[PDB]
Design a protein around this ligand. Structure first.
Ligand SMILES: Cc1cc2nc3c(=O)[nH]c(=O)nc-3n(C[C@H](O)[C@H](O)[C@H](O)COP(=O)(O)O)c2cc1C
Ligand SMILES: [Cl-]
Ligand SMILES: [Cl-]
Ligand SMILES: [Cl-]
Ligand SMILES: [Cl-]
Ligand SMILES: [Cl-]
Ligand SMILES: [Cl-]
Ligand SMILES: [Cl-]
Ligand SMILES: [Cl-]
Ligand SMILES: [Cl-]
Ligand SMILES: [Cl-]
Length: 383
């Protein structure tokens, strides 16, 4: 064989256009054709996935150029593996984007459309599940269209690919969450290294961390309810998780950003972990994010009229939920009263996000996210 594959994830320049994508595709088609490289490029919501395959030398050279490109950043290698045969034969470099992005760019082949519609807001689907699903889907479309070019492929076909990948990961993740919950319930600070190794193995991205934390959080909420652990124990666990999070994920603020967003806790609530997670997730998709823990409504009012950052995410506290709801209501309402800003957008999480959007209209919050990992998606809708 002696064929190798390399795949990465990167953050497209916030000002990326169709002309750019097309230039990339043409340059790549020409060069990959000469150098005997094949693969696919997937663009969705400011993010790139690329797969490249060929002889080692060819892949290395082209990656040397790509890594230095200025139309994307935060290039993260995902795989460098030997393959037995090409997954994208005949595709020197094929472009593909999501259905939503297809709408947003005004496109309708030859660009392979991927329908994320049915699975995008499914919190059981982890980041690597989505990556693998896109890979398998595109490789399959490549085979298919090699066999029958004029035979169209249903976009929402991708849904099944994603769901299947996630289901494959499900049991192992259940084990991880169980083991984790045990650690957090016993002595999470005495065994922080084990907590970290677990989190590092099962949560490659910040959104994955958030998924695990949501699962653990309902587990421990149950435990505390049944008086199986103490409040002090939940505090310990919370500290441990903050430390583990900072050790593992700590993205710098994107220099080229898609926009700016303020992440705040409700005064008295200390959504330290959840706000940190919110910031990591939003930074990972290209948002400039600031975390604020105000102790008054007026403070945040000041920071907002000073920042002119028209978007505010109220991070929920998923472990102090005795009175998170009415507190958040009062806080957001008050904020709206002290404010004179028609462009301001407010997003809310937690139990408040579980109410029907009629209540959301009634609330003064603009939109909700019933789960942390849904935050990026909820934000994009408002922007
Ligand atoms: C997301 C992305 C993917 C790219 N993929 C390839 C590729 O597969 N093959 C290629 O030759 N260039 C690719 N490029 C472009 C190169 O980084 C660079 O434009 C080119 O290789 C150097 O220009 P040159 O024609 O003067 O050598 C890609 C760029 C971006 C931003
Ligand atoms: Cl891969
Ligand atoms: Cl979509
Ligand atoms: Cl998806
Ligand atoms: Cl990802
Ligand atoms: Cl994973
Ligand atoms: Cl595959
Ligand atoms: Cl485990
Ligand atoms: Cl401890
Ligand atoms: Cl340990
Ligand atoms: Cl405004």
């Amino acid at each position: 064989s002696d064929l190798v594959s390399c795949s990465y994830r990167s953050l497209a320049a916030p000002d990326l256009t169709l002309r750019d994508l097309l230039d990339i595709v043409e340059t790549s088609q020409a060069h990959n054709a000469r150098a005997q490289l094949t693969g696919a490029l997937f663009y969705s919501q400011g993010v790139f996935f690329q797969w490249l395959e060929g002889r080692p030398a060819a892949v290395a050279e082209v990656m040397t150029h790509i890594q230095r490109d200025r139309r994307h950043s935060n290039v993260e290698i995902l795989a460098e593996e030997p393959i037995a045969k090409r997954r994208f034969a005949g595709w020197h470099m094929q472009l593909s984007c999501s259905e939503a992005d297809m709408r947003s760019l005004g496109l309708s082949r030859q660009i392979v459309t991927v329908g994320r519609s049915l699975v995008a807001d499914n919190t059981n689907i982890f980041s690597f599940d989505r990556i693998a699903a896109v890979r398998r889907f595109l490789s399959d479309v490549c085979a298919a269209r090699t066999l029958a070019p004029d035979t169209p492929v249903e976009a929402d076909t991708f849904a099944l690919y994603a769901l299947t990948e996630a289901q494959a990961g499900r049991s192992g993740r259940a084990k991880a969450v169980a083991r984790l919950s045990d650690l957090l319930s016993t002595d999470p600070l005495g065994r922080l290294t084990e907590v970290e190794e677990l989190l590092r193995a099962h949560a490659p991205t910040a959104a994955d961390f958030a998924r695990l934390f949501e699962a653990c959080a309902e587990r421990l909420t149950r435990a505390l309810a049944e008086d199986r652990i103490s409040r002090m124990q939940v505090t310990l666990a919370y500290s441990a998780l903050q430390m583990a999070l900072r050790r593992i994920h700590h993205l710098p603020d994107p220099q080229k950003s898609v926009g700016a967003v303020l992440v705040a806790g409700v005064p008295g609530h200390k959504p330290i972990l959840e706000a940190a997670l919110a910031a990591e997730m939003l930074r990972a998709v290209g948002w400039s994010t600031s975390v604020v823990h105000p102790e008054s409504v007026a403070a945040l009012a000041a920071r907002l009229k000073t920042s002119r950052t028209s978007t505010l995410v109220v991070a929920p506290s998923l472990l102090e939920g005795t009175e998170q709801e009415a507190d958040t209501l009062r806080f957001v309402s008050a904020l709206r009263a002290r404010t004179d800003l028609p462009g301001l957008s407010i997003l809310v999480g937690g139990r408040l996000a579980q109410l029907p959007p009629s209540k959301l209209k009634d609330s003064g919050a603009d939109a909700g996210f019933a789960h942390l990992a849904l935050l990026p998606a909820a934000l994009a809708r408002v922007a």
